[model samples]
Target: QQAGTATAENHPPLTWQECTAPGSCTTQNGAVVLDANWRWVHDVNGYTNCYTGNTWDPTYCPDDETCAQNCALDGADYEGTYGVTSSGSSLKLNFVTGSNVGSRLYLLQDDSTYQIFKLLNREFSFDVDVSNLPCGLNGALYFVAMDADGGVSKYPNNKAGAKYGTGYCDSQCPRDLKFIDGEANVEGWQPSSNNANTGIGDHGSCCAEMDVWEANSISNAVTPHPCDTPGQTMCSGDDCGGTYSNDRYAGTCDPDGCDFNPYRMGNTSFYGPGKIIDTTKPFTVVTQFLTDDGTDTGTLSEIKRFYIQNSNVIPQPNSDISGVTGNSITTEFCTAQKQAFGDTDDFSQHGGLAKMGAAMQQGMVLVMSLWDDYAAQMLWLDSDYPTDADPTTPGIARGTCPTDSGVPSDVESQSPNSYVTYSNIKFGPINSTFTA
Candidate 1:
């Protein structure tokens, strides 16, 4: 519940724009902060790590209260320690930084304040280059319902808040987080059998997630996973229910989500190595939140997708299936797509798009991350999901990746050099962030 002055906290500078028109935009001097879970948690009076290599130190961290008081979250050397670099308008994340495998980062209005966003009736645009990313890895740019101050106000014990990246949640209900609600997650902490750097804790953080982009060179998806709650919520044990839990649907979050992946919709050649929306180069992605009444306070009716490459604006391709019509995501699209895919309908289980819109209206935080899946090996994204399912089936075949590919252990060893770069973030009214 305190900070360690051993390392001076410095956020890497990143510039983005707030636009009212196509050419009229104001540059904002923003920064990026590493997640608090990734920071060095050491003894308050000494250099000994309170938590080290997937185990809590018995002496300093015997329990939650003592662990919180004894431990101090220290600042990070963004580049040297985590392989994160921010300059100008771009921020790049490396897959493997020394012993650290992957990273998650939050955009900050300044050094300590998170950049909160309300995109209910607006649009968000960003350019991402995932050229270096491979089949198993994911370069994700998403929004989550995290507190602006990083839970410092909600949890009295949380002294290191947004600056140290204290609050982070997603539809996944991530049980692997080292800290939750200002305390070290020590109970039933189980180390990974394949990874030395990660393990499961007793608690997981849960919230609504708008996965604007989850991609690699081989495949891509736009998903919205909403929870019943509007903001950060915590769960415990098997009830956490995400990738870490045996029962994936036990939690409150809609874990599987209603996804709109071009590849999943049988348009494999639309995005890839040499496809129309080439993966070997950078491209601008624009997501618009269209409202029913076309106003700032209207109900969210749909979410549209567009791409800009080589000065050409390419709207999302319509679904190849005869029955699936629009490229945009809507309640109708999700209902029909789930039935077309013959998949479980978890999206509607939690109020669907309306719930996501409700959470967004409350404002959310932008997150960019580079990570490889451990449980399912990311087969869900780029390969034949449910691995045993027939690829020839409607949505079974997600991409060209072999079902055997994307093994985390293998990918980590084979593609440790993988990385992703995201830049040129812009927010404004519809059709304003980018040029026509």
Candidate 2:
């Protein structure tokens, strides 16, 4: 069998000639793109260029199922190009495989000299023995595969060394499921009526609605909303007047009608000691605990609450102590700290766990409050994407801004240079073209 030959006659080597520009038979220097796997990745446009030049057209993979058609290029077609051909010998690929969906395997020549080689995306079991490859190469290599939900499943482990949900392989595949909030959404489809699309989800109540946006710091005013009302406003209603009034959702609405915006860090939901009340100004104090290697003698079950506001200081119960917070602080998993304790931990008499729990209380209260304030403003702006300056361009430079770094690389880099780079996103549809 040839280096790139597949055991199944239906699958053949994807040659470079068939993966070139329109009317061109030679390989373009930068034609190949590298996928997560070592196999070459090709752009959807490259396939068209090849087809237009009278070369064989690539195959179509309409479904997630890795059948003969979908598995055209070892099932690693990131650009969604797939097909089988018998016309050529030289493989044209950067990295072969789709979104974390299959194993990327390759057969490299033993000689050290630079030479053309063949790669394969295959599945070999743990018990399968492969002691025959050259000394320099290992029997197995890494390949990235993704489940139907766009959850990345690398060849070895997805994360924490655990195999992804079962029944997914070259022959057997897993059923598709709705993706939740996380890093796996790179290629995920946006479902209708999903709050996450608007950035609201399990993060918290303030994050529960699409209307709430992060606010500006110094002014404490809701961003994107020019305040027309008295006093620095917090919620949307304050800016638009009583007609659009809604809860700033924090405690106490001032009689004067100023929106009291509460601020917390990261995810808000922190339970601490007695209630702290500030009737005058929006007062926020964050508590932090630093735990060392040692632990404290305090019962992990003890409930201690702390309150700083001017009103009554009532104790909030401690929840659970499952894990330590960073270097120090340990409480029963999910338990709140005691306000009476006042963030005290005697490390000299405490064990590692107890001290860790105690330490966590300090930061939790302070951090949560800080994050809430900052996050509220961000939500208020309702500008999750970038605030670009230009209109003609399609990227950050062209006034196109995404909330995070996960946007497709091509679209991100090309945003400033070409409108076509973000055309699909700008024009409100994914423009797909095909030729045969």
Candidate 3:
């Protein structure tokens, strides 16, 4: 049966309510709210651009073929300019070139505050084709849980309020339940006649990685520090310039070795040796969120990832994945800011699995997106190996940037044929058959 249909005796039918913007709907007593299902609506009066920023401008987008065409090209079609298309049982998110670079689409759902559903057991499955995806591009199909206001701290008493109340800190709570990330590496693909890489073959690299992250309600306040500096001890809340210390540096500062440094080295969270997956062909990615002891309200313990190639389930290189513990997410956020500004006091004060549990208790929405990883903010996919900025050695030069790498050659050449399609999307009680 489809997700919303009433099935087993215990689980009732899932209901959905639609709204024009995030956090705009009233809490349902028992049902969940599935908002943002339509195409991107732009507000001409609002200066904030929906393309880059997450702010909601309620102004209606011009409902016409011209607007639709632009929306399709930009990957923001919510009004049917080629945006989320439904064909029978399958949903296709066509990732086009040109204006569509760095495009993102979201499918969100949430339970009302004070009332949440336990994930009990659930599976999210999908099929994708990345044959035409060019170097410097990364596409991901993942499930995340966050505050009702899309992680913005509003209504302190509501699910969108204070971190302490929700057991999470900040407004942008992104507790990754499962992440299936694909990056276009130069080393992974063979040079085609249409797109030749004469001198770049040796430098190409591709990866398919997965992760599960959790948050806790620890009261300790952490501070942010520059990642460039080594031997900096973790500081208490009051000792550092910032009010809290959330920097969870795993080890010594070696940009080349640290998984956190994207400019020089790729993130350690998803770049493990056996984590790679071949993206040229169609494949299935699945994740199971289970309790540690297999009981409801049990510690939201372990999350495991599995890969299906040619209909065969492949075991991961690592055993049951244990997401980054402690305050890694908060620290990672602070470290990124520190790297850019050299030093910044701004850092997240709230974090922990308790906070995550609080957010999950209220349930969350599912999101999927495709964008160029080579953008200034995301330079990890720019090179195969880590290197300093100027005297870059082999495999360290930036591969492509937003300005230089317009629409990918293959995407532009193939037209409608070249696209990313997602099918067999299922979410229900764990291990249940996910159907149309």
* TM-score winner: 1
Clashing pairs in 1: none
What would the TM-scores of all predictions be?
A: 0.98, 0.18, 0.44
Tens-digit per-residue lDDT, 12-33, candidate 2: 2222221222232342121111
Full-model lDDT for every candidate: 0.88, 0.19, 0.30
In TM-score terms, candidate 3 sits at: 0.44
Q: In candidate 2, residue 269 scores what lDDT?
A: 27
Better of 2 and 3 by lDDT: 3
Candidate 1 lDDT tens digits, 132-180: 9888889999999999898888887888889899889999899888778
The numbered model that scores best in lDDT is: 1
Q: lDDT of model 2 at residue 198?
A: 19
- The predicted structure with the larger TM-score, 1 or 3, is 1
lDDT of 3 by residue, 1-436 (tens): 0011111111111222222232232222222121221223222233322222222212222222222122211112332343344443344445553334323333423222322223434544555555544543445443333343432233221221111112121121111100001111122212234222111111111111112211001000111111211111221121222211123222221111112222222222322212244445655655555555666575444444455766666533331112322222233333443354333222222222223333344454343444432112233343432334342332243333332333354434444334455555544455442221
Name the candidate, 1 or 2, with the larger TM-score value. 1
Residue 151 displacement in candidate 1 (angstroms): 0.7
